[PDB]
Structure formats: structure tokens, C-alpha cells
Amino acid sequence: GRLPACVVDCGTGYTKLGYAGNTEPQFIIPSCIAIKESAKVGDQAQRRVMKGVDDLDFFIGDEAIEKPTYATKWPIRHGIVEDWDLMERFMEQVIFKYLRAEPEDHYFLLTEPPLNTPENREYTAEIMFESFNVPGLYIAVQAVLALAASWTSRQVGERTLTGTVIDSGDGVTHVIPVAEGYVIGSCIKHIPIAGRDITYFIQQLLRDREVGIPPEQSLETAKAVKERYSYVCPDLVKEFNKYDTDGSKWIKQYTGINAISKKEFSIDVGYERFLGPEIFFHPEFANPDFTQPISEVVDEVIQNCPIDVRRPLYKNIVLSGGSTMFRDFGRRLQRDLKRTVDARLKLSEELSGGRLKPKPIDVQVITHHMQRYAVWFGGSMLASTPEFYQVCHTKKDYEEIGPSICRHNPVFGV
Amino acid sequence: MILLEVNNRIIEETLALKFENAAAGNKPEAVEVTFADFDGVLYHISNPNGDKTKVMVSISLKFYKELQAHGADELLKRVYGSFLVNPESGYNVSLLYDLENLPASKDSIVHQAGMLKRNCFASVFEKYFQFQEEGKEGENRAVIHYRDDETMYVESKKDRVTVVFSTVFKDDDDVVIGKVFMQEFKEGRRASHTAPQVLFSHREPPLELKDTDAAVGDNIGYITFVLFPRHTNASARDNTINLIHTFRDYLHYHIKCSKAYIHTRMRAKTSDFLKVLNRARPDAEKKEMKTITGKTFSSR
Amino acid sequence: WXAXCPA
Amino acid sequence: DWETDPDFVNDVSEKEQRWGAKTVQGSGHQEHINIHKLRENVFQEHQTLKEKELETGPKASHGYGGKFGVE
Amino acid sequence: MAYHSFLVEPISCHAWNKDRTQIAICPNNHEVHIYEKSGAKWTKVHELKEHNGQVTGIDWAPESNRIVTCGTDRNAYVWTLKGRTWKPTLVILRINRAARCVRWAPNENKFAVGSGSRVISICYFEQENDWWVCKHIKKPIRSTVLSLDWHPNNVLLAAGSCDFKCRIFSAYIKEVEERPAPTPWGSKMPFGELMFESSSSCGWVHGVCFSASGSRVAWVSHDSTVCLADADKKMAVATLASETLPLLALTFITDNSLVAAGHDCFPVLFTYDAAAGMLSFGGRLDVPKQSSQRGLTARERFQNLDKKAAGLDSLHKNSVSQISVLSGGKAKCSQFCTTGMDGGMSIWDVKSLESALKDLKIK
């Protein structure tokens, strides 16, 4: 008989492991690896050669953050794997320790961001096909699986196959318009500004103002401040004024534990309540290359799709990923989008001569019960169908053509 | 991780979560989690007939028939008590935890629930340990089909227990590296003054497999462990069972880590060859000093 | 220094 | 525009966060459901929605009499 | 005698003016750089930038002081010196592939551009319209035209090709000059005629050159062979097969002796014996120089111990690609200039070279 396919959604800040056919990932670990690192001289490809069996003395996931004598490395940066040695070791413990899957009896469904270079896919195919020897692989785009995770929380008869998926993870934020089940790939947008940029901005804010934060935790604090006291503001300068004139109400206190002497430190959370998420509607706060808000990027995405599929795309904007769990994020997004759309419609009516008043475009932003792991569940659907075993790259295909079998994805033509 | 572990993580995690939700007094939610393990084992944790108060953990194995033989459930019964119930349709063993009658110290039953496969294996294996302890020669010797193309022939004598693994790997690269990993397996007895006699053979099957249906062929390797009464006593048989159980999976695991090991040496040698090529690029006369980003220096 | 010598 | 709340805090453990946050009043560990039934139900409901979206849209087959009618 | 390295990138082609005080080179890009001899050092005086692709042929007419440049943009330009700047006049070549070589005629009334379109373009002037026009010689050619050299009677034209053949066409233009006088090559000379076609079928022809008197045509092949066809002997071919790497350029320093160079980076000398009809390896012209070694500093020792864990005994460190005659003409030469793919420019001397080696006799 057949065994369920393994689903491994490898994200920059968190990896979701499971067996296809379930409702939620069996494991959600941090995407980090603790290896023994010491003071050495020479290149990186030369000091990584470990004598004996010392290359198996490493940990991953939750067990890699606890280890205080190991060095913690993150192999994935901005969704693109920058280190393949650490990624191979991470994958081998993901398969042989957590999933406990024999990699020769299970099809694998990995994930990727839209702008993953083809050489990354070729290296992933080389790893899964020659090292782990999987009978089949399928590298699906991350946000396109997040659409089929909003159907579990919406009433019957309004579970559509058309919508704009906004996936904001730890390292990348991408916008994918799906229409009737077909990924409109030539309209996908991809911005490397995401949760971790918010965490760097927040720690730089805290470090310029607060005192008493242990250095070795200056990041771990900026996550607990970001994922707890952060919201979205309707206006920036008005919020600065609201904090200045009535600071006794808007300024909160965060009390953490210094995990060396177990003492407690206390800091004041002020402007970084609303300046964190604001790098979504002002990306220049974290990366001066991008200057375009997320509402305008979504509007460009939808306005580039075919005409008669623009009106349903506005109706089912599905959020996904952790970085979209900010209070009143969807509300401000929908407000800006409604402003843009109504202004465009009124301009078109005025240019027409003033005879017809067209239907106001319904704009809706869908928050659902599965956002934190909306991608994985989507995979758990796709990798549970029969047709799945018809779209995978069989081992024969790799043995015949080579890793170049995995070189194409729906973002580029030919 | 060098040695594979015997306890499954998903079972322990799910059952501990359910027991924390039940002990705090929250209302129980549904659960339906199906997954797999090594050697083609299939687990299913669900509820019996939508009854959200009972959790049934079922397991389907490959040694289907050897566990149904009389006396192959002594260990399972002894360890699981009243949790052992009739198998769920399609599966082979099944435990049933009532979330309202859970005894105190919920850590022990979860630690023994994560080792369901190890316990099903040790139950069909301690039969011969006992056949040898009780001082009886010629006791029953069988072939556990612990996989689908590989076998484990167990035999119990008056003074020893012989375990013959008939093993074969699926992939060609894995076969070629496994020939080495199995040839070099007798060089391990130099690491300990007390290790079971290990014999390797791939020219011809041993004389134990001439009356039995253990898998034989010209692509199969035979690894014979001779466990003596210092490895099968009532105090060191747990470790022996764990090792004999996870031997094949451990060999497969390390065969698949050997490649990720070799890749580092290959990268090192690639860089060493690039350094020999670099002697061909004529050194520039003057370089423009840049910044960490790569922009012009903007100053002297 | 802290103990021994000044620095 | 819309007013904000100063005293809102969704304290959650990192392990609680990995599943969901108190900013979405339903997120977290959900009740396990059958996935194939959901898939087929979504397929059928999308088919039914497409049928009515076609019926309520402009119809080229409107002037041939019968159920279509005469222009 | 000297060696000057203008740049580290190859030099495609170079050209000197009448009094050999200025040189026009190609820096391996679209521009043409005109340097001037100022005492002992060189100083760039002009930059000519009109081409779209890198120039592959420059030629400087001595008497009229007009430069002609052909490049890989399928175009040709004639630069004239207005006051202080060189202004270009575009020539319509009508080719559909990259040009390869250009050569002024001896009388500076027309110029030949060999291109990779399997044609030769004889360009001349139309003062009735101020129109640089061109005619085409394209019949027996089947590949790129690599090298050109004109007969001293302003009509015949030697052309080497990548079709393994050296040919002698007749570039007579009946609207800029009179009917030419009969030469030992043939009495019938209409435009596009074929007076001579070598019998070789191996190796491309990198360089052709007419004699000083226009009675002998010599050429070099990638087959390592140097050949000479004599017209006073029923167009007889004398070949010499060398045992070194091939040659790329050659010239006539006398009516009897040739100076070639190529992928060896040093000039060699050949001689022709008319009383027997056979070439003789006169020998290497350059004396093998001993390149001084330098002690390494600590910054350079570690820089090339981390990064990488002269071999050649001539002036040029890369193959020599073009040889020109500086002073003395082709009847009795005294200085020849070589430019190669190392950006260097070696001004040689025949007297000093003959003095340094006494085993070296110039026929």
C-alpha cells in the first residue's frame, strides 16, 4: 500500500513538518541549526571539513536554540537558501529524526518563494534525488497553497477558487493572484521586506532609547515586543502626537527575564508599537530601495491580471503567513485599496461623460483560522490527492534528464 | 544524532498535548492524525466513532503474522495493561486511552506510547530470549519479515541467539556504498572488548537459511549476529533489542549521511583547484577601493 | 585590571 | 480614520504563536477535519458559483427562442 | 629600437602617418586612439569615437592625411583633420556582416575593405555628389577576407581568405584612374578579375603582401607554412613548412627577404632564392632576452600565497598580430613596427638586429 506523502514547508523563520492528509503540521520548529563553531582561519569551504563523525554533532529546531555552547546558524535568508551544507544537514535530521520517514517510500512536497533562482531548485533536486533518493518531488510556490486554507473558515457556497494571496513570512512578502485555479504567474510580486526586517527595526529602536536589555537577547526581546504590543495606525503623525500628549496611556511596559542570572528587566514600549508594522505601508523604513506601499503593490498586481478577472480578485484578498497577524492590518489594507479603486472608478465615470455609474468594486480582505500555517495545510491538501502523483517528478525523470527537470516554475515563460 | 532513537515524536507530542488539554479541564477537541515510520509502519491516532473523549492509537506493521502467533502478546499486554484493545479495522495493534480515566503521572504512559513499534517488535523477539534463558535447545526459530524485501531470521539455542539479517538496498548508489558499509562492519569489534560475533557474507547464504524462506539472492547481503548469554540476560536485553531492531535503519541513515559528508571534502578540493587556476589571471596594477556594499569609496 | 595591577 | 486601542495585548508564548495569535479570534489548534471532503465540496461550490455567474452575466444565446427567448 | 605597452588589452590594428610621428591604435573597443611621439614618451592626442562595434581595421593615407576605419558595425569612416579635430565621413559598404580589414591604395584615390560577408569592397569618391561609393568583388570568394595588400601599380590587390586560398584580384576602377599597364600577372585586367589563386587547401591565410616591385606575392598560413608566388616564373609557388606555431603578419623588407611574426611573439626572417625557387629559414630576428626576476615583498608574498596557493623570452608577451614598415619602404627597409595582442608596440631596427647576430644574413 501507499504511505502518506511528506510535506516540508521550509520558511526563513520557521519550518512546518508533517505527513500529507492531516489538518495541521506535525511540527513547527525554528529554521535554525546549532553546530560547533570555533575560532579558525581560512575559507568557509575549508573549515567545514570535520574529521571522523563530528559532522553529525549538530541540532535543529527548538533543540538548537537551547544549546548555549553551540553556534546557531540560519541557512535560509529571504526565503533563498544561502548555505547548502547546513541545509542538507537540516533536511537529513528533518527526515530521519522528526518525520521518521524512510525517504525512499514517500513523495515529498517542498516549497519556495516566487523568485527562487533555478539553480536553487536544481540543488534541491540534486539533494532530494541523489542523497535522499525520494521517489518523487514537487516544489510548489508558497503562497499559492495558502489560498486553499481559507475554505475551512468561510460559509458554504462562497469558497471560491479565485483570489489574491498575500503571504508575508519571516523573510519575504509575495503577492500571487490566482484565478479559477490557474496561477497568474506573470503578475506575481515579490518583496524581500518581511517579519525579520520589522524585528531588526524594532531592536534598533529599542537600543537607541532603552537601557537594561541584555545584548545576547536584544533580538529575542524585539520579537516579544513586536508580536505582542504591535498594531497598525490609521495615521502616523497623529499617532506620534497621541503618544506625546497622553503617554501615560499609550506607552506600555514589557518585563522579561535575563536568562543568565534569572533577574527581571523592564523596558518601555512606545513608538515601536506602530512603527514596526508601518514598514509594510512605508517599506523605506527598513530598505531604502523599495518605496511602494503594500496596498499599491496589491493594486498593481490586480490591475495587471486579465480584465474580466479583476473584479473577483478584489473580492477575495486572502492574507497568509505570520507577519499579517497585526491588529487592523487587513482593515487598513482594505481601506487604502477601496480609496484607490473608488477614485479610479469615479475618474472613469467622469471621463465617460457622466451617463453611467458602474458597480462599486467590492474589496474584501479575508483573515481566517489558519494564517500562521496557511501554506502547509494547502500543501497537505495538494499532496493528499491522487492527481498529485501525476504532477510529481518521478525518480525515473531525474535519472534520465538530471536536475534540470526542476528548473521551471510559473513565474517566467518558455 | 549518531544512533537512531526508538521513540516516535509525533505520538508523544500528540498524546501529551491531549493530556494537557484534558488535565487542565478544557473540553476535548477532535483528533485524526495519520503518519508513518521506518520499515513501512503506519500509525493512526483517531477517535472511535467520533467519540471525542477516547483516543485510539493504531499501528500497522510488516511482521503481521509473527505477532499473531501464540505468546507474541506477552510483552504488549504486560506493558500496556488495560490500554490494549482490539485492533482497529485495517491495523494490527491498537491502544485506547480514555481522557477521563487517565492515571496520575501522565509522562510514563506517553513515554511507553511513543515506543509502540519498538514494543511490538520486542514482544515478538523476547520469545527466543526466553527460549534460551529456560535452558531448552532446538526451540522455535522463525523469519521476521520486518520489511518487504528484507528478512530477519531469528534462532534460539541452548547457549546463544543467532540473528541473520538478509538485507538489500533499493538505489544503485546506496547499493554501491552499502557494500562498503557492510564489508567494513566486522572492524567494529575492535572498539569494545565485548561485542557480539558479527559475520558478513554476500557470496553465499549461511547454513542457517537452507530450510527456511528468508530472502536469498545474488544482490542480498547477510549479516549474522551471535548474541551470547551476556547480551541476552534479563538486565542487558533492552539495549540488545533496541540495537537489533534499529540496525538496518541505522545503516541506511548513515549511508545517506555519508554523501553529505563527502560533499564537504569535494567542495574543499574544488576550491583547491580554483586556487591552482587563479595562477592564470594576471594581477591588476591598480584596484579601486570600494565599500562593504560595493559603491565607489567616496573618499581617499 | 580588577585584581592585581590597576587597569 | 478608525480609532485604535491602547490597552490591547495578545501575550502568547513563542510556541503558542507558531500556531496562532490573539489578534485573530479563531486562530490556533483547529479541530481535525477530512481534507478530501473539503476539497470536493469546494470544487462543487465553485462549479455552482460559476454556473450562476454565467447565468447572471451577458448571454450570447438569448435570441434563439425557447429557454433562451426571442430578441 | 624600443618597446612600449599602450595598454593591457589587445591592439586590433595600428597605422602610422607620413613622418612616423603619430600612431593610431585600437584599445580593443569602439574608440580609435591617436598617440603622438613627444621626445621619448608617448602622449595620446586624439580620440575618434563614431563606431558602434570595436574597430578591426585602421589605415592612414600618408600624402592626404586621411584615416579610414572599418569595424564590426558593418560601417566604414574616413576621418579628415579639420583644424584640430578629426571629422568622419560615412562610407556605405552595403555589407551584411562585420568588416575585417581596410587598406588605402598607393595613390590614395580608393581603399579596399575586406569583410566577413564573402566580398571585397573597393570604395572611392564621387565629387559630383561628395559621395563615398563602393563596388564589390565577390565571385571566387567563399569566406571572410582577412588581409589585403595593394600592388604598386594601384590596380591589383592581394587578398587572403578563410577559404584556405590566397588570390590576386584586379581592383581597377575606371572612373578614378587610367587603364593600367600590363604586368607579369596578366594583360586582361577588368574589375573583379582573378589573376592568381593559390593551390593550398589547408589552413587559413592570415597575411598577404606584395613585393616592393610588384612581381612577387607572399603569404602566411595557419598551416604554419609561408609561401611565395613569383610572377616572372610562370607564377611558381615556393613553400616553406615551419616547425613552430603559425604566423599572423609578414612584410617585405627587401625584394628577397621577409620578416614574419605570429603566435611565437618574436619576429623571424625568411629568404627567397630566385635562382632555385625555394624559401630558406633565415632565422629568428630577436635575441632571446633574459627577463630579470624581482624579490617579493611580504604584502605580495601573502597576496599570492592566499590567492594562488615570464615563460616567454621576447618583447611581446602575446602573439604578434600586425607588422608594418616604418621607414625605408619595401625595397630596402630599416625599421618595422610590430603590434600584438598584449597592447605593446615594438619599433624594431634592421641594422641593430643584423649587428647583434652575425649568424644572420639578409639576402
Place this chain on the structure above:
Amino acid sequence: MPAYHSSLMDPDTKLIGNMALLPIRSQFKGPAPRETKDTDIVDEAIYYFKANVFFKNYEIKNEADRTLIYITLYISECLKKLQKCNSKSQGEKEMYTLGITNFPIPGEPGFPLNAIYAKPANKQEDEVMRAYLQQLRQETGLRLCEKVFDPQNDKPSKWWTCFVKRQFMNKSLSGPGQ
């Protein structure tokens, strides 16, 4: 989304160089007229400062934007000196003696924005611009010394001295980082 520009340009506003000589509600001497409405350019600049320091693109639209740019650049200099003080009665003296200190004006070395600021055309315009900038500096320091210092402990509040490292488009009236 664009930064916060000033909305005080009027078609009858006079120009000095190419900066809007906007009226200011102050007591110091200067060539700028007196304001009757409750908001001058300095109040607007102090209102928009905390937000304008985070943006990294600022399109100059009119001359009032150039005046607001100057004042936003000078608040960053006031903050550097107010960070060291420990009493509002000392902050006021520091702000006075800083406003007196002559900073570079358009068209001189040290001014960060000579490219996008039209220098004076003669000597009279030079003098008027000097006096105008001095008045702006004095009044900005005076108004800011009441914002930075909170009355609970009478020392610079950490909510204003955290913007010492934040530079408006990485420009400053002082030296390059000194």
C-alpha cells in the same frame, strides 16, 4: 507613501533666495512678518519632525518645503545639545547660544544642500537670509526647549533624545557626523 510636506505656501508669499519667507510667531528680531494664525512654519516643523526622520525620500515641491527642510535639519542640532543638559533653565541658555551661533547658509561650504538651494544674488539678500535663518533658529530652539523637557523630573525626556541618531535624509547643518 510620500513624506510629510508643509502646506503653508501661498501665491503671495515672498521669497528669500528660493526659500519661502514665511511669517513666524516669535519675539526675536528678524525680517519675517508676524503671524496671527495659531500655526507658523516652526510649529509645523516640530509637529512633523518625529515622522520625517524615518523617511528616506523627500521630494522638494515648493519653497515652503525648503524652509521646513532647514528647520527639520536644525531640530536635529538642537537635540544634540539638549541631550547633555539637565535643567530647562540651562536648556534655554544652550538654545539661545546655539541660535546665536552662525551656521552655513545656501552657497557656502558646509551647507549640505547647496545643489538644491539657490544662493543669494547680492549682499542685501545675503544679509536678509542670514537674519531670517537666525530668527528661525532662535524660535525653533525656544519652542523645542519646552517639548524636550518634561515637568515630571525636569530633564530631557527619552522620547525626544532617542532621535539624536536619526538624521533627516542623513543630512545635517554641522559637519559630516561630527
Place this chain on the structure above:
Amino acid sequence: TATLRPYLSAVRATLQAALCLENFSSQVVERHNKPEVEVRSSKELLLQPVTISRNEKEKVLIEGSINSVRVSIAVKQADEIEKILCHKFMRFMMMRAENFFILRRKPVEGYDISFLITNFHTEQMYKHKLVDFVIHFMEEIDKEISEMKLSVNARARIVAEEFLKNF
């Protein structure tokens, strides 16, 4: 080594009989400048492909042209382990084919590795040093693969000792 000395001398002498490259613009397309041995567009700019072999299964195929040389190497592979290691090693060499300027991201069918030296590599980089690099690769590849094999054997022994120690 000393058993490859005549084979390597012949290969080196054939390498610097080719590698006498020149600049050349294409004939079958307007302004492209492409290596003439890769496109095989014109049959007049292609020299004879010469093979130099030490035995039946170790060889070098050299394909010359007017502005490019393609050198394909078929390396010694004695058994299956050496075949696997040679494949993986050549693959890890191809991965960095922009640091090796003369390398080729895919070997010619039938051969283990392939170098493609155009004329820019002989104008901007030392020619004799490129010849030396090719000959050094051919000298040392067998030794490095044998050391890989010994490393695999040592790994197998260490794994066996790590298992049989717990009993």
C-alpha cells in the same frame, strides 16, 4: 605522476598547437561574436577533432576552432565507487563555472569534464598557465578521487565502531 608522463606530454603538446586563437566575428548572424566550436555554424573555421588516449577508457578530445577550443576529458574510473565519486566531484566543479573562467557547466556527452577556452581567455589570461591548469587537473584528479575513496572507507569504519560499541 610517472605513468602518465608520455600521455600528459602528448596532451600538452597538442594543447599548445591549438589555443592559437584569434578574434573573429560571426558569419551567419549580423553582429554576434560567439565561440565557433560551440555553435558549429561554419565548417571552415573548425579544425580536426584530435583524440589522445592512454588506454581504451582514459582520453582527451580536443576540438579546435578559430576563436575557441573545447577540451573534453574522460577520466579513469576503475569501479563503481570511483564512478560515483568522479560524477559528484565533476558536478561540484561545474557548480562554480564562473570562478573557473575556462570551464563548461555541462560536460560533452560521453566525457567526464569539459573546458571551453575562447580567445578572450587567452587575451586576458596567461595562455601557458591555462595549459598548466589543464595538465595539473589531469595529473591530480586520480589522486584526489583515490583520497575520496579512502575517506569513504574511513567513514564506514567509524560508523561500524560507533554502532558495535554500545552492545
Place this chain on the structure above:
Amino acid sequence: DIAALVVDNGSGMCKAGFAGDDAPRAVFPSIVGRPRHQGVMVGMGQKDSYVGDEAQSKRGILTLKYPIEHGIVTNWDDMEKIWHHTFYNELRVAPEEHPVLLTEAPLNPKANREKMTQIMFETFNTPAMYVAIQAVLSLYASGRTTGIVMDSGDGVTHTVPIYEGYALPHAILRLDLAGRDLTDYLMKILTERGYSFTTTAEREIVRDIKEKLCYVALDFEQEMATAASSSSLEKSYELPDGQVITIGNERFRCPEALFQPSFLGMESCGIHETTFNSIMKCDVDIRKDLYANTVLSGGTTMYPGIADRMQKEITALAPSTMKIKIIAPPERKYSVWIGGSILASLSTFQQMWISKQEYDESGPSIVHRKCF
């Protein structure tokens, strides 16, 4: 390639430059001045802290404080002031765009390099840094991979033996005895003649007297008996106010303290015996290669005739068959910096940085993992 600032910043004098040159771009004494009198002339502009050469020129009205003492940073505010003056005034370069290669003496407290990393990452926001050991850079500058470096700076002296690149970390001998102790000793012994320098502004005068007149005697007792029996060694130096002083016997008594610290009331052995002990702690098969590769550095080894003294002293302690070479180049004072520029200009060194990202996630405890 990338341009990386190399900031030696040892005790005594800070020498900063760019990686790839042959000499530090800016060398200035690492001092911080503070006015000690009232300001009465308002309107001329005043500052409350002078740094470097400006503090040296105005030393008449300042209290010069060294932020580093005996190789350890003891006042971090003045250290930040020194670094700010180095970045924005001497080099005039933005520090948030270039890597920084700082140096530290061996066997210093870990809190020193920890706070150094924290300052360089949280104050100046350098994108990457690296903390190297001074003697290793000194060996780089000498262009050899074997030898014992004997670096005698202004606040600390230390020897490091290295063989084929493998530095022996169990034979590194440190000794808190350097130019500042010698300057204080000269201040002490200058009283017996009749001159009294007692304020921190005159210590600079004493340091100039030392580094212009003092030298090392080849045979101490012979030179003492000579200068005590004839006025042929006395030299006259002019103070910055016209006074002239004459020093005789003192000239070689100041540096002699380096070879016998019993003058300063210390128990430790001289620098020659320290180097010999460091050598003798290494294995027997490499000592012969160390003896012929002794390297000096630091500005305290610039005394006339110290190479000959060191050779004559080591030769008396080493077997009569070992050849003792004292490789003292005439650019010894800048050697520690010159080796730095060599190091930061290497290709593989880009893989040894401490990237700002790597620190943002691990705090100051990363320097002990990325830098030995």
C-alpha cells in the same frame, strides 16, 4: 574587493588607515584633554574635550588622560571619543560602510574585546569587524610564517612564537612593562639631577626627551663607569620655554629597565629572558628555527642599539651552536599596522568577518567564536 579600515589603536598612539597601503594614514597620540580653568573670553568658541593632536598642542591648560592603560581600555567614553575622532576627523570616512580590523594584545580580559565589539557595532554601526592579535599581524608584516614576535608597545610587551603558521598558545608570554613605565621611571630618575616634571602635561616633555635622547647600552656596567668618569655622554635638550637641561648617566638608565625590571621594583624577568623563556617553552624540534627568526616591533624597540643588546643577551642564554638573528626592520614602529593592512587585503579574509547580521542575533559573545 572592498576597502577595510585598519585601526591599530594600541596603547600610547592610535594609528589608523586603509587596508592596502604601506603606512597608516593618520597617527596621533591617544589622549583626551579636559580644561582645568575657567573660561573668561566668551565669543571665541570653546570645547569641553580635546582629542589627539589638538589636545597635545593645548596641553598647557589640559589634564591629559589616556583611555587605555597597560593594553586595557579603562574609560570607555574617552575610547569612543578617540574612535569618533579617528573615523570622522582623521580618515574623514563614514564608518557604517567599511569593515574594521582592530587589534588587541594577547591574554587580555575578555570583557575588553566584548565591549569593543559592542561599541563598534552599536555606536558606529560598522557592517563587519575583526579583532586580531598584534604579534600575528607583526609577523605578517615581516613576510614570514615562522618566528617569535617580540612586540613591545607603549603599555604592554608580549612574545608570540609561531611555527609554519601554527601558533603555540601555551608559550605566549605577556609582561606589563613598556614605554609608559619607562617614561615614569625617567621622570623619577630625572629628579636626582635637579629637574622635576610632575604634572601630566610635562610627562609629554619627558616622553620626548626619552624618545630623542635615550638609548640602550651594549654593556651596562662599562657604560656606567664611562659616563661616570668623563663628560662625553651628556646631551642637552631645550624645554618648550627656553630652558636647557643636560642629561648624562640617565640616558641609558631609562631603557635599561627593560632588561632588568628590578629598577622599577618588579620581580619579572627582563624582556630578553622573557623571549628566551617563551622560546624554551616550545618543543625541541622548532627552537632552532625560532632562534634565527626573532622579530622586534612596537615603538619601544626603536632605541638605538637594542637589536645588538638583545642578540648579545640571548646568545649568552642559548647553546653555543644556535645562530641568533634579531630581525629588526627600520619600520618596526608601524609593523603591527602594516601586517593588518596585509591581512585585511586578503581574499579569504572576507570569510572571517563578524557580519553585523551575525552580531544582531548573538550579542557580544560572538567575538570569542569568530576571533581567537
